[PDB]
């Protein structure tokens, strides 16, 4: 479990005078990742991030964050710079051929990057569609493209599987439709299971 969740806990407890907008917060690590390197046709890194986000029907989510670790991937001459941009798309239709070069996508967030470290992408829209799945089109995944600029790192990318460090994860903020009624009901049943 990410320390981001832990710091959020510390934030809530130290600021009793300042109540947060969302009660329920969940962390979802990436389930699987499909990575395609930059080509002359598509000069950028392509990543399809598969998650397993499952928020209960009785809950109404408010915000979702996609946290990515931007880093120059240990290339020689890495002191030459680290600057570019990245774009995340909600994948509707995929295809086991190329990434970006196929399927249907809905653009979520455009992010310019500079510092090595964690970036936060507000991709609430995508998760809301994932919650109301309505079967039909298979989703619960998104595509992130990383565009390296001229005077920058040749290996500018986000840390993804099959890597083991600084992997992408979701942070879903949620509240209860019944204003905490149905929530505490299920919390009780949960605790009874954990009781024995």
């Amino acid at each position: 479990p990410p320390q981001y969740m832990i710091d959020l806990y510390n934030r809530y407890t130290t600021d009793k005078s300042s109540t947060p907008a969302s009660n329920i917060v969940r962390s979802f690590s990436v389930e699987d990742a499909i990575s395609t390197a930059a080509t002359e046709d598509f000069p950028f890194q392509k990543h399809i991030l598969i998650f397993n986000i499952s928020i209960p029907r009785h809950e109404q989510i408010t915000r979702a964050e996609l946290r990515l670790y931007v880093s120059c991937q240990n290339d020689v001459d890495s002191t030459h710079g680290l600057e570019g941009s990245m774009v995340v798309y909600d994948v509707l239709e995929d295809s086991e051929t190329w990434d970006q070069a196929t399927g249907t996508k809905t653009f979520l967030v455009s992010q310019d990057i500079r510092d090595e470290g964690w970036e936060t992408l507000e991709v609430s829209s995508a998760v809301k569609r994932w919650v109301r799945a309505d079967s039909t089109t298979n989703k619960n995944k998104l595509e992130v493209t990383v565009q390296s600029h001229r005077e920058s790192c040749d290996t500018l990318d986000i840390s993804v599987p099959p890597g083991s460090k600084n992997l992408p994860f979701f942070v879903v903020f949620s509240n209860d439709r019944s204003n905490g009624t149905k929530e505490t009901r299920l919390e009780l049943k949960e605790m009874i299971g954990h009781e024995q």
Binding site: I6, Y12, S22, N23, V25, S27
Partner: protein, 106 residues
Amino acid sequence: GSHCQKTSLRVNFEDIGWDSWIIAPKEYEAYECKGGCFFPLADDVTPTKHAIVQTLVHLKFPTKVGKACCVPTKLSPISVLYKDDMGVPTLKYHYEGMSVAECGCR
């Protein structure tokens, strides 16, 4: 065994084995209601009509009917970080019903 009132109760999740799913906090003040609901029942125990009736009945038939119990009234929520049944990390600002706000006779 004096007067129904709220007392201090520090609960460590490690002690009760809830450290397997509760991430934070490690321990918290849950409070406890101690004392008896002796005649007469005043405002400070927010009694019900049944509690008052039973207490009077107890006075008449102490060998057959017991007196009201000192239990928590309304409960205060605490902040809890924990893992779901699916192992999903979950943080809730208001995890209702973890500590005692008021006590009373019921």
